[PDB]
């Protein structure tokens, strides 16, 4: 009902959006292949009133007129695509990416998403799938009586059969790289779908063109730095308190205006 | 006077005078909920029906 | 009431699940033929307040819009089927497996 | 008579309606799958005075409340019978009289003869019949409800949970107990499997919480209170002016 | 006298009910065979005013018209029937259930009640009863000179007498399973009775088509998760705060109208 109250409303809600960003980063600390988010804010409208630059006194201009502004709006949340710390779990099926690549996964509805989480499983038919049951592409099929599975750092997959001293290559694991990795739309389940701001999927085998190198037995942990999150808590709390103080002051002013 | 009142027979009367529509005096289905529109269109809803 | 509260609530349940998994693993140290568990987590819903890649203008496109996320959810609790260390009890009725078989 | 009492009165009534909407939003902060309401105010007719150019207003009137159909947060119930929706879609539930309503509350139960019902006891289309000796009920992402039985090493398919999608989600009629019925403004209920044709996915063990943001409601309460005080002051001023007029 | 006050009163009552449920759950932490309860709320009615979908004008309709809602009301409290963690009390008479079955007892009135708690004792006449003195069906009679009581996984109660290498069977403990387990009426005293919404009691052997396995020397503790209760207590307190603030705001508005 009054301008200062609307400006303070944008403020509280935006510090909350921060708070949501902080809470989302914290809840996914243990998530493998997670990237922390950071929100960017911009200024809202600026009422012109006295125009800065308009000529007063015929030969003297007016510098810096009344640019009364409105509150704040968050521009967007950008993910920090940096290399998370590698953790050794000693498993034949965990694959960790050390560079800037993505695994390609086919959703059963027909389209393809992209994931960085490398904890892979085998279905009843022998295919390499994600822990959510989504089938990895290209399409690594593993034989029935496998004794050991070896995933090289070049993405080649070998299976050691009984009675064969030489491993047999059963597939080739590729990495997908994009022009802009922040433009991928996160749909949950550690899955990204390609958008028009993220360019087009560039297939590359691991080691060339930039795709990273694949480590076996390692998992890429989340890059969330938690002490920074606590310091951000302390601000997101003090800023919200101060905006609420502004709301209270405007409320008192309106109350005295009403009471007279 | 826009204070329109329905009757048990369903006709629209204002101060006892039936309201005149494009088909003459307006008769509305009995026991229905009415929503006059910005152009006077009368929509009738039967209670219980979707 | 507040989204941040729900996100923290989930995170608390996820960490409690991790703690329960660790406690169960430690409780079965001396048991033979045991396979320790491990929990896997995934991203929950993602509120698309502003669509990443939305056509803000006929020429410019908005990069990485307002993707506010919800908490976390455990995908599953998978057992690590690996060969445990063999120990000699020296009884004729005690048998151990070396590969990846199961007794019926 | 002809004055400003009615203008101010119509104003107060608008603030009362806004406060009712805020109170309804706050009271349903614990309901699962609740969409917050926002009342839209848009002024009354104008009276034009002709010169030998000017238009005087009449007040403000509520037009229509809109329900915000954003995807709410998910919470935990560890109950195998509860399913939440990721995306836009509605569960179809059959009322006793025969007409099918649409709900988003995913907290379901099994009734005395099998059958999946909502918390109010109404049966959920498509009808599911859970067997008695079921050991675990699994509802897949694409709505396949499979049931495990002791002995058989394969789960048994029972039913498909189809989602009904409306092209205009806001126009559904809220009948009361967490149920919507289709209306002329939200026609053509499109039945689909979850995951295709724009239908949402299903998360088992999670329920969709309410969409009510708290800060907006509190600051809006502050604004409503202060505007109500302002309109009351205007009413008092008109009263005093009329009192001064009558004493002549 | 004013609508917003009734709505906020309903909200306050619902939050008080939620707090009552939380307190009841926390008060029964040490109770064996206890299941935690969760309340579910619904909104109440909706004032019609302007029927949405009506003809706004001869060719156009009103999209999402003016609906004014009333407060909130609790639908029901559902139990969470999940296996509470087991505990070893090293007692030959304590019995725990691993699956989904119930023990049957006879009330003094002659009717049959069902309890999951397995803390059993023996009366002066030698029959197996619960802690409240209710006789557990099917009425296993323990003889005078018993040395050890063995209750197996399938529900057989055996007594080993002196000098006899074979154990004497003295009963058979069965479990009752319901189609709707949450529909039972809890009468307190860890006892549930059959209602028409809980189907019919199906007797079965403990290990058969879905009755659970009986463990001797084990007790099933409550499934109450306490950290969740603390977080929910915080949530309930804040919601009650906000509803009370709504009541106070309505109180302040009616004051100005009185002053008019």
Curated annotation (Swiss-Prot), chains A, E:
Keywords: Bacterial flagellum. The keyword Zinc does not apply. Pfam families: Flg_bb_rod, Flg_bbr_C, LlgE_F_G_D1. GO terms for cellular component: bacterial-type flagellum; bacterial-type flagellum basal body, distal rod. It is found in: Bacterial flagellum basal body. PROSITE patterns: FLAGELLA_BB_ROD. InterPro entries: Flag_bb_rod_N, Flagellar_basal_body_rod_CS, Flagellar_FlgE/F/G, Flg_bb/hook_C_dom, FlgE/F/G-like, FlgG_G_neg, LlgE_F_G-like_D1. The basal body constitutes a major portion of the flagellar organelle and consists of four rings (L,P,S, and M) mounted on a central rod. The rod consists of about 26 subunits of FlgG in the distal portion, and FlgB, FlgC and FlgF are thought to build up the proximal portion of the rod with about 6 subunits each. This is Flagellar basal-body rod protein FlgG. It comes from Salmonella typhimurium (strain LT2 / SGSC1412 / ATCC 700720).
UniProtKB/Swiss-Prot annotation, chain B:
It is found in: Bacterial flagellum basal body. Transmembrane segments: none annotated. It comes from the Bacteria. Belongs to the flagella basal body rod proteins family. The basal body constitutes a major portion of the flagellar organelle and consists of five rings (E,L,P,S, and M) mounted on a central rod. The rod consists of about 26 subunits of FlgG in the distal portion, and FlgB, FlgC and FlgF are thought to build up the proximal portion of the rod with about 6 subunits each. This is Flagellar basal-body rod protein FlgF. It comes from Salmonella typhimurium (strain LT2 / SGSC1412 / ATCC 700720). The gene is flgF. The chain holds residues 102 to 151 of 251 of the full protein.
């Amino acid at each position: 009902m009054i301008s200062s109250l609307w400006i303070a409303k944008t403020g509280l809600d935006a510090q909350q959006t921060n708070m949501d960003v902080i809470a989302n980063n914290l809840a996914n600390v243990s998530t493998n292949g997670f990237k922390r988010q950071r929100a960017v804010f911009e200024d809202l409208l600026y009422q012109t009133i006295r125009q800065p630059g308009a000529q007063s006194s015929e030969q003297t201009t007016l510098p810096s007129g009344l640019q009364i502004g409105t509150g704040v709006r968050p521009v967007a949340t950008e993910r920090l695509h940096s290399q998370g710390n590698l953790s050794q779990t000693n498993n034949s099926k965990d694959v960790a990416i050390k560079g800037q690549g993505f695994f390609q996964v086919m959703l059963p509805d027909g389209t393809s998403a992209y994931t960085r989480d490398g904890s892979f499983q085998v279905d009843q038919n022998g295919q390499l799938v994600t822990a959510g049951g989504f089938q990895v592409q290209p399409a690594i099929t593993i034989p029935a009586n496998a004794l050991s599975i070896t995933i090289g750092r070049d993405g080649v997959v070998s299976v050691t059969q009984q009675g064969q001293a030489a491993p047999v290559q059963v597939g080739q694991l590729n990495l997908t790289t994009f022009m802009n990795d922040t433009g991928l739309e996160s749909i949950g389940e550690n899955l990204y779908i390609e958008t028009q701001s993220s360019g087009a999927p560039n297939e590359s085998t691991p080691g060339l063109n930039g795709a990273g190198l694949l480590y076996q037995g390692y998992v890429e942990t989340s890059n969330v730095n938690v002490a920074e999150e606590l310091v951000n808590m302390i601000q997101v709390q003090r800023a919200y308190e101060i905006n609420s103080k502004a709301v209270s002051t405007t409320d008192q002013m309106l109350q005295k205006l009403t009471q007279l | 006077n826009g204070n329109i009142q329905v009757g048990p027979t369903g006709q629209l009367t204002i101060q006892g005078h039936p309201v005149i529509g494009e088909g003459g005096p307006i008769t509305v289905p009995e026991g229905s909920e009415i929503t006059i529109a910005a152009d006077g269109t009368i929509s009738a809803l039967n209670p219980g029906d979707p």
